[PDB]
Amino acid sequence: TQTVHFQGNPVSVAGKLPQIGDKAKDFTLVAKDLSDVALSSFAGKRKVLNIFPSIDTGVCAASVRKFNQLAGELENTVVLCISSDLPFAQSRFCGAEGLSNVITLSTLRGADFKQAYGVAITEGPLAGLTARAVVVLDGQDNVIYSELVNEITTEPNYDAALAALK
Amino acid sequence: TVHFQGNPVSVAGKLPQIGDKAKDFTLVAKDLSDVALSSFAGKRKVLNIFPSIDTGVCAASVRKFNQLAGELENTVVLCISSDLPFAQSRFCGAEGLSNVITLSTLRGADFKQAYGVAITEGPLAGLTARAVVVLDGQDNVIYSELVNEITTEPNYDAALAALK
């Protein structure tokens, strides 16, 4: 069981984030239209899994939208912005707003994903939400990049996530 | 069994009837803190339960009812949805109201079972059903309605009348 920080304060995160060389578990999550979307749906493609505590925000950092868009226009690649936000709140997100081959997914259903990818925050004011993380998967579900950011409010290594794509 | 345009939808458990005791719950406020039912000791509680309050335009009758119940003496209106405290702030029917507080399902899925509002079928599975439950000062149910159509308004007039 890992441990991260929100603004300095310790946050317990249940499970274990898939290491490089692991086979990532299949999941099913909720799309914007309330339709269900499985990881099996993208067989062969590369999957950038960008995990957020919340994407429900008016203000967006340029690097977030820059990372998502860049990885999105790479050949045979898809970006998945996942949070515990409801699909009604996920559609006001700048990092995925109008970004081609970048879709949002809610944990409204299939919330067991959180435990399976070691991103389930289980203590304090952020309980029921996900920990900030990026996980990059190859054509056949193998983890080629993974990072659990020690401080939640800070950003993951975007250059490195891109450099594995490659 | 409720209905969402169109066709039947299952709801786990069932709504507490008049005469029963409420059964304590804990949900999440807008500041992300924990708020328990027992924290409103002595007050009457209107539990206005929604599938989602995250919208930029509401029917205003929803705002009217919460305002009227909020105005009444020794009363607290608790608007409950599955929306996160980030999305509940937008709501056009609880905005800047006096005694109307929004509460989130985030880490209180235990409330959804104890009060029988958990939708388990269709595109709405994991969301909450439309229902109004009114409690007195001693947390006794004095009015309960589970609307069998999600796009349909509950009997506000009857809910208000039970407080009189």
Author numbering:
A (entry chain B): 2 to 167
B (entry chain A): 4 to 167
Could you give the paper's own sentences about this structure?
Tpx constitutes part of the bacterial defence system against reactive oxygen species (ROS) and, correspondingly, is upregulated when E. coli is exposed to oxidative stress. Atypical 2-Cys peroxiredoxins are functionally monomeric, in contrast to the typical peroxiredoxins, i.e. the resolving (Cr) and the peroxidasic (Cp) cysteines (C61 and C95, respectively in the case of Tpx) are situated on the same subunit. Tpx contains three cysteine residues, two of which (C61and C95) form the redox active disulphide bond. ypTpx has a regular thioredoxin-like fold: a seven-stranded β-sheet, with β2 and β6 running anti-parallel to the rest, although with an inserted N-terminal β-hairpin (βN1-βN2) absent from other peroxierdoxins.
The redox active site of Tpx is made up by CP and CR (C61 and C95 in ypTpx, respectively). There is a conformational change between the two states, involving the partial unfolding of helices α1 and α2, and a shift of 8.4 Å for C61 and 5.1 Å for C95, respectively, as presented in Figure 4. Rigid body modelling of the oxidised Tpx crystal structure against the SAXS data, using BUNCH, based on a single chain, and imposing P2 symmetry yielded a model similar to that for the dimeric crystal structure. The binding pocket is mostly hydrophobic with one hydrogen bond proposed between the ME0052 p-hydroxyl to the ypTpx I153 carbonyl, which fits with the chemical shift change for the neighbouring T154 amide. The chemical shift data indicated significant shifts in the amides of residues from both subunits, highlighting the importance of the dimer interface for the generation of the binding pocket and compound binding, as illustrated in Figure S2A.
